[PDB]
Amino acid sequence: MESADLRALAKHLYDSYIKSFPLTKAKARAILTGKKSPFVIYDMNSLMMGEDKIKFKHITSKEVAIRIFQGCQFRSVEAVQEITEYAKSIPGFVNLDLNDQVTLLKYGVHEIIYTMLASLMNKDGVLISEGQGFMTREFLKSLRKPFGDFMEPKFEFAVKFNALELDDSDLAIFIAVIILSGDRPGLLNVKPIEDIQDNLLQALELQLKLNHPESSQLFAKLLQKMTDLRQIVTEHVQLLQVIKKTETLHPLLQEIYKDLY
Amino acid sequence: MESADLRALAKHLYDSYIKSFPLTKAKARAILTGKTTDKSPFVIYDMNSLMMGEDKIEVAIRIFQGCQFRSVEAVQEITEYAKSIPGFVNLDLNDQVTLLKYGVHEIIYTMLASLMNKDGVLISEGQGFMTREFLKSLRKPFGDFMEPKFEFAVKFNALELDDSDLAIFIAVIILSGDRPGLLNVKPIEDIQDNLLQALELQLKLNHPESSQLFAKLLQKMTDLRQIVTEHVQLLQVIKKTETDMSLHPLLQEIYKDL
Ligand SMILES: [O]C(=O)C1=[C][C]=C(C2=NN(C(=O)C3=C(Cl)[C]=[C][C]=C3C(F)(F)F)C3=C2[C]=C(Cl)[C]=[C]3)C(O[C]C2=[C][C]=C3O=[C]OC3=[C]2)=[C]1
Ligand SMILES: [O]C(=O)C1=[C][C]=C(C2=NN(C(=O)C3=C(Cl)[C]=[C][C]=C3C(F)(F)F)C3=C2[C]=C(Cl)[C]=[C]3)C(O[C]C2=[C][C]=C3O=[C]OC3=[C]2)=[C]1
C-alpha cells in the first residue's frame, strides 16, 4: 500500500534530475563509448587549443596546473547551484527549517559532486563542457606538484563507483538520500529529515530491485559506497588545505570559492 | 537465497557469537539496569575508588593499559568468531589476515557500545563499572582519547540491536571486499552478499516496526570507518609522547600500515 507511492517518488525525482543537471549519465556514456565527437585534451598544446575551441568560461596565474584546478573549482560552483535546485524538488525538503536546509546542502554537496562526477568519467578521462570536451586521465595525473595527486583519486573512486552500473533513475534517488542525512553537524530538527530519508531509502530499494533484479544486494552495496564518499571528501579537504599553504586571486573570487577551498 | 537457509545462517552466527565472546549485550544490559543484588558492579568514579576497586575485583597509563589488554583479548575473540563464518577459513590466507587486520577495530568499537551507557562502561567481565566523567577527565591526551568511544556508543545503542543482530552485523564488517590489498575480492563479496541477506531478514523479523533499520545499520559502518581513522591517528600521536606506553605485538602489527 506504498509501492505506487514509491514509484511515484522515483519518477518525480528522475524528472527533476533531468531538468536540473546539464549532462545525464546516459548521454555521457554515449559520448565516452563513441556510440558529435568531443575535443580531446591530452597535453599542454591541446589544452591551449581547447580553450579557444570549447569556449571555457573560467579563463581570465598562467601556470597550467593552476588553471586546470581553477576550472574544476568553477565547475564545482555551478554544480552546487544545480544540486541546490534539485534539492528543492525533493518532497518535504523546502518545508524543513531554513537553517537545516542550508546545513544539509553545505555538508552534502561535496559527496554529491564526487558521485555525479563519476557519471562523466571512465578509466581514461573525463567529460567537460557538457560533453564537448574530454580531458585524459594521464594528462590530469601528470600535472606537477600536488595537483597531479589531487586529480587521480577522483578517477580511482569513479572507476569503482561506475562498476555498480547505476543509471540516472537510480542516481536521482541516491543523491536525494545523501542530501537528507540526519547526522549532519548542527541540525536543529533531525526527525523530519530522517522521516524523508526513510521514504527515499524505501524508494531506492524498490528502484534497484526493479531496475537491477539480477544484481543481488545492490542496495546494500550502494549504501557501502557512502563510506568511500565520506572518506574521500575528508581526504579532499586535507589536500585543499595543503594546496592553500603552498601555492602563492581577487578577494571577490576568493569569496565566491570560499565554500570549496 | 532461501529464507530457511538465511535463518539457519543467523542461528549459526548467533550461536557462535555466544561461544566466542565472554560478555553479551543481554548480560551487560542486565548489569547496567540493575534491579538485581547478585550482579551489581563496583563503580569507579575517582582515584580513591580505583584504589579500592583493585582490591575488590601513573593512573592514565594504567587505565590505558587496562583498555589495551581488553582490546587484545577482543582481537583474539573476534579472530575465533571469524573462523566460524562459513567460507571465511576457505579464503586465501593473505586475505584472511587482511580482513581481520582492517576489520577488528570496527568490531571492537561496535561491541564496546554493548558494554556502555551514557554514564560509563562495564569492565572486568561486568564486575566493575568505570564512569565516563572519570575517563574523560584523565590528563593530557588520554581524556580526549576515551570520550569518542562513548560518543559513538550513545548513537549506536539508540538502534537497540540485540546480540542476535550484532552477530550478523559483525560478520558483514569482517567480509568487506573493499579492504586494501585483497587478492580475491569476488569470493569475499559472495559471502558478504549472503550475510547481508541474512542481516536484512533478521532485522525485518526481529524489529518489524523499525523502518529501514537495515539501511540505518549500514550507515553506521560509515561512522565506524571514520572513528577508527581518528583513533589510529590519536594513538600514533600518543606514542610520540609516551615511552611508558607499549602495545601488545598483535595490536602493534595491526597498526603497521593502518
Ligand atoms: O559535474 C561536473 O560536470 C563536474 C563536477 C566536478 C568536477 C570536478 N571537481 N573537482 C574537484 O576537485 C571538486 C570535487 Cl570532486 C568536489 C567538490 C569540490 C571540488 C573542487 F575542488 F574542484 F572545488 C575535480 C573535478 C574534476 C576532476 Cl578531473 C578533478 C577534480 C568537474 O570537473 C570538470 C573539469 C575537469 C577538468 C577541467 O580543466 C579545466 O576545467 C575543468 C573542468 C565536473
Ligand atoms: O570488549 C571489551 O571488553 C572492550 C573493548 C575495548 C575496550 C577499549 N579499548 N579502548 C581503546 O582505546 C582501543 C580500542 Cl577501542 C581498540 C583497539 C585498541 C585500543 C587500545 F588503544 F586500547 F589499545 C578503549 C576501550 C574502552 C574505553 Cl572506555 C576507551 C578506550 C574496552 O575497554 C574496557 C576498559 C575500560 C576502562 C578501563 O580502565 C581499566 O581497564 C579498563 C578497561 C573493553
Does residue B109 contact residue B152 with C-beta atoms inside 8 Å? yes
Q: Which of B6, B211, B222 to mutate to test the interface with A (most CBs of A within 10 A)?
A: B222
Report d(CA B144, CA A154) in Å as an integer.
33
> Which grid coordinates belong to A115?
558521485
Torsion of CA B64, B65, B67, B70, to 10 degrees: 170
CA distance B212 to chain A (A): 6
Contact B221 A227 (CB under 8 A): yes
Expt. technique: X-ray
> In DSSP terms, which residues pair with B43 in a beta bridge?
B129
Chain B residues with CB inside 8 Å of A230's CB? 222, 225-226
Chain A residues with CB inside 8 Å of B197's CB? 216-217
Contact B219 A226 (CB under 8 A): yes
This structure's resolution (Å) is: 2.1
- Most informative mutation of A117, A129, A135, A143 for ligand 1 (most atoms within 8 A of CB): A117
A234: number of Cβ within 10 Å: 15
Q: What would the DSSP string read from start to end of chain A? A: --HHHHHHHHHHHHHHHHHH-SS-HHHHHHHHHT--PPEEE-SHHHHHHHHHHTT-SS-----HHHHHHHHHHHHHHHHHHHHHHHHHTSTTGGGS-HHHHHHHHHHHHHHHHHHHHHTTB-SSEEEEGGGTEEEEHHHHHT-THHHHHHHHHHHHHHHHHHTT---HHHHHHHHHHHHT-TTSTT-S-HHHHHHHHHHHHHHHHHHHHHH-TTSTTHHHHHHHHHHHHHHHHHHHHHHHHHHHHH----HHHHHHTGGG-
Ligand with smallest separation from the Cα of B143 = 2
Domain interval for residue B76: 2-258
Ligand 2, atom nearest to B111 Cα: 1
Distance of CA A66 from the midpoint of ligand 1 (Å): 13
- Most informative mutation of B45, B64, B70 for ligand 2 (most atoms within 8 A of CB): B70
Whether residue B207 is annotated as binding a ligand: the answer is no
Ligand with smallest separation from the Cα of A51 = 1
B53: CATH: 1.10.565.10
CA-nearest residue of chain B to A224? B218
Whether residue B70 is annotated as binding a ligand: the answer is yes
**Residue A139 CA from chain centroid, whole number:** 21
Distance of CA A25 from the midpoint of ligand 1 (Å): 16
Distance of CA A83 from the midpoint of ligand 1 (Å): 14
CA-nearest residue of chain B to A199? B212
Report d(CA B185, CA A224) in Å as an integer.
15
Whether residue B105 is annotated as binding a ligand: the answer is yes
- Residue B37 Cα distances to A94, B30, B41, angstroms: 54, 11, 10
Report d(CA B143, CA A241) in Å as an integer.
28
Question: Which residues have C-beta within 8 Å of that of residue A33, sequence separation ≥ 6?
Answer: none
Q: Ligand 1, atom 11: nearest CA belongs to which residue?
A: A72
Contact A216 B193 (CB under 8 A): yes
Tell me which residue of A175, A216, A6, A154 sits closest to A93, measured CA to CA: A175
CA distance B223 to chain A (A): 8
Count: domains in chain A: 1
Does residue A56 contact residue A134 with C-beta atoms inside 8 Å? no
Whether residue A86 is annotated as binding a ligand: the answer is no
